[PDB]
Ligand SMILES: COc1ccc(C[C@H](N)C(=O)N[C@H]2[C@@H](O)[C@H](n3cnc4c(N(C)C)ncnc43)O[C@@H]2CO)cc1
Ligand SMILES: COc1ccc(C[C@H](N)C(=O)N[C@H]2[C@@H](O)[C@H](n3cnc4c(N(C)C)ncnc43)O[C@@H]2CO)cc1
Ligand code: NA
């Protein structure tokens with residue numbers, strides 16, 4: 001369609017204060033009756049323009065009068081000649097069973113459910129579908145009681161009835177005014193897990209978790225995580241739940257992960273269901289994080305919502321920041337930080353160099369569903385974490401309090417939030433606001449100097465952001481740049497200047513500046529950008545010895561990991577260059593030694609050891625290069641794995657056996673040891689073949705949990721061990737009837753290093769457990785192939801591109817949101833070599849030419865070809 005621009009925001013000409021919905025539900029034809037109380041604020045001659053998509057209009061009344069002064073345009077009902085106050089009644093029809101895009105009211109198996117964020121409510125009825133219009137909802141649902149015994153919407157059940165012909169109804173009322181993107185409705189038959197939580201101040205909240213019949217056994221962990229979320233929001237932010245009931249529904253057909261609809265969250269069943277033998281540690285920790293996320297939105301999203309969709313990061317940056325803090329408080333703070341930083345440097349940095357690059361507050365949008373992004377979410381959270389770094393926790397909490405005090409019950413902007421932090425804290429964030437408007441990854445370059453005469457250490461720090469496809473003009477940011485200086489014994493040198501302490505978070509606000517530290521009694525080794533204090537690329541000329549020194553002595557665990565990443569980065573680059581010339585891996589002995597030391601150090605948290613022994617993904621590796629050679633990166637990852645496996649064989653085996661655990665528990669210390677153990681297993685799989693096959697075949701068959709079974713099956717696929725096909729067949733035979741469990745298997749198929757992997761993936765389009773109608777299946781087979789198997793996707797013959805093209809040709813008509821996610825690997829063509837660009841550009845040109853090209857794909861394809 002048309003592009004929308006943030007600078008065109010204007011307050012609406014009309015407001016709706018209250019809406020009274022009735023749904024006469026049927027999967028083929030639902031009848032919606034919508035009675036809205038409305039108020040004109042604009043001019044007497046400005047019509048009311050209601051958004052609407054794929055609605056059949058049955059009638060329109062204004063204060064009970066059949067209205068003649070209206071028309072239908074593309075995506076709208078435009079109503080003229082209105083009074084200043086009136087009751088709008090719309091009756092319209094929709095078809096949930098036809099809805100394959102999973103936006104609006106649609107069917108997930110036998111259940112009916114909604115997804116309204118961002119602009120989905122307009123697929124349900126004609127409305128002011130924009131988030132600065134907030135209204136009190138009342139929702140009456142009528143349905144067949146055999147098919148739809150449970151009828152749910154936001155808030156409290158206020159009314160109930162039985163009708164003739166085996167139909168019944170229920171009515172719901174939510175007292176908190178809300179934007180329509182927070183409306184939900186669910187109808188179906190469910191098992192329900194019921195529990196309670198008592199808030200800090202004494203309010204008893206009924207908790208209800210609705211899952212498909214037969215899954216009540218995969219529900220307790222989710223329930224436990226919801227309670228943990230409620231408690232933690234109380235402890236850390238002082239925020240209590242505000243209603244009497246908290247509902248969560250797990251559905252199998254869902255485009256997002258989870259939707260924070262007020263009092264009635266709707267979740268991808270992936271981020272709900274877990275059993276010891278179906279779900280890994282990471283699934284558990286994911287379920288905790290996503291449950292937390294949806295819950296944290298209750299304040300950062302719902303009680304304070306977004307003025308317009310360009311303000312998405314107001315709620316997402318802040319709510320991701322909150323789910324990261326929650327995971328970090330409850331588990332390992334370092335491991336959380338490490339994985340969030342992996343995602344930043346490996347996926348988000350790629351997005352900010354791509355044709356889809358955008359600031360965390362976008363300036364232009366064609367299809368808003370395209371902006372539910374790594375940038376908006378993860379970079380968003382980094383921006384919030386930077387405010388925290390600048391203010392400290394006490395001031396940050398005061399800013400949170402001021403934000404709620406001012407904006408509770410209304411829609412706000414990114415700028416309102418920054419303003420609350422600034423006013424509450426008395427820290428100036430004027431310059432800081434430039435993080436919201438500027439796209440791309442800044443590059444921070446650092447040079448140092450030690451003067452022994454004066455005992456001064458000088459840092460010369462410079463920054464630039466390169467131009468991005470969306471912005472030609474770039475300016476310097478306010479970069480909180482955290483340092484520590486270590487002496488020759490590993491002790492922290494105190495930071496000072498002119499005889500007074502200096503804060504260790506430097507305000508790097510200029511294109512270039514110099515910081516001078518005094519009483520630096522010994523030439524330091526620095527930890528730069530501590531805890532990834534700003535989302536930037538660091539350019540510093542490290543020696544290997546500086547890096548291994550940091551691995552042994554750095555105070556913060558994250559710095560030890562990060563030092564190690566910098567150590568490996570030099571050698572990854574070296575060996576990618578070697579690969580291109582036909583040369584085998586080269587690696588200095590002392591690099592191997594550094595990793596041996598981590599394996600055998602008995603004092604190191606095993607959580608941390610595991611992360612140091614987890615090599616950068618092919619995605620983190622790709623960001624070290626201007627032009628990406630995806631085949632060299634994959635082969636080098638495998639070769640570096642083989643070489644460390646050979647060098648460290650005896651140490652790896654010892655640590656593998658030492659961390660054996662007979663009991664399975666979902667507890668942070670046990671997860672650490674298991675994670676280290678399975679990191680050792682993965683190297684061992686790439687070692688001596690027989691021993692590998694034995695270890696892996698055995699762990700798979702003996703495992704009492706899916707973490708251990710999958711780590712092994714995954715190693716078997718990756719090293720191409722002899723046991724592979726047999727373990728993979730066993731897994732399929734046992735688990736084919738279970739889609740979430742099979743997703744792991746499809747990911748393994750899709751990411752296999754085998755030579756015929758595409759041929760297998762095509763074949764798996766026919767597999768019993770695959771369906772093009774399910775986003776989860778699609779993402780696990782097709783999406784994993786294109787995103788996570790770059791060597792096969794980028795096969796020289798272009799076969800990966802054409803496969804994706806076929807898939808997208810289907811998905812563009814079926815589910816454009818999923819299509820748009822799957823296209824993302826093809827729009828990175830400018831990172832690749834000429835011959836690859838040529839073939840990727842042709843693929844995009846083929847897709848550009850589809851009849852009924854979705855706006856979702858259109859936005860991306862044209863940016864990519866520009
Ligand atoms: C939706 O719910 C979740 C669930 C879990 C997480 C945390 C987890 N480390 C994690 O999955 N983290 C990551 C990623 O694994 C994955 N991801 C997001 N975008 C891509 C991508 N591009 C082609 C865009 N390729 C491969 N994987 C991608 O989604 C997460 C974004 O942080 C985040 C969000
Ligand atoms: C083949 O290529 C593919 C295939 C699939 C994807 C989807 C990817 N998991 C993904 O980006 N998915 C996500 C993320 O980028 C972000 N997001 C959504 N929810 C969260 C979340 N909490 C729920 C914890 N935390 C962090 N980020 C989140 O919004 C997106 C849409 O819901 C991407 C690329
Ligand atoms: Na009017």
Ligand SMILES: [Zn+2]
Pocket residue numbers: 293297315316319
């Ligand atoms: Zn969210």
